[PDB]
Amino acid sequence: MNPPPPETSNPNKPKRQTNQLQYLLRVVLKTLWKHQFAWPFQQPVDAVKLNLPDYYKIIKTPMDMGTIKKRLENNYYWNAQECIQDFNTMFTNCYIYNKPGDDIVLMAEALEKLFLQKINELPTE
Numbered sequence: 589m590n591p592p593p594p595e596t597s598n599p600n601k602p603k604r605q606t607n608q609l610q611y612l613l614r615v616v617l618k619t620l621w622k623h624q625f626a627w628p629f630q631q632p633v634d635a636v637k638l639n640l641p642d643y644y645k646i647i648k649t650p651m652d653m654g655t656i657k658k659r660l661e662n663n664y665y666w667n668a669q670e671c672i673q674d675f676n677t678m679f680t681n682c683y684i685y686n687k688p689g690d691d692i693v694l695m696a697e698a699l700e701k702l703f704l705q706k707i708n709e710l711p712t713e
């Protein structure tokens with residue numbers, strides 16, 4: 589069964605827009621979005637559709653680039669580090685639930701390299 593997707597806005601959580609957050613959406617997210625291995629990470633894991641009845645029994649902090657995209661578009665993050673933590677959570681969840689050698693793991697490893705490749709240099713203030 590699928591839990592509700594992660595929130596992309598919160599009236600109690602303060603919003604903020606920075607140069608690095610604009611960079612994280614314009615170049616980081618949107619380039620990773622166009623990678624050939626991006627399709628398994630563009631939406632929350634549908635455990636019912638994907639026949640993964642144990643996914644949310646294991647993953648208690650799910651994350652995907654679709655949620656990250658909407659959060660960046662809604663200025664959900666306070667700074668760039670909070671957004672980067674969502675990217676790291678998405679990758680770590682994939683390595684936690686799956687095993688080395690899986691196609692999904694090779695695809696997450698390729699996106700993670702390109703992710704670190706593009707956050708290596710961020711704009712200043």
Ligand SMILES: CC(=O)c1c(C)[nH]c(-c2nc3ccc(N4CCN(C)CC4)cc3[nH]2)c1-c1cnn(C)c1
Pocket residue numbers: 627628629633638639640681682685686692
């Ligand atoms: C467990 C795991 O780490 C996974 C993650 C983070 N994501 C997927 C995943 N698998 C998919 C298959 C198809 C699609 N599509 C194609 C059509 N398009 C419209 C978008 C939806 C999206 C998919 N995401 C898996 C996965 C690996 N094994 N399984 C059985 C699921």
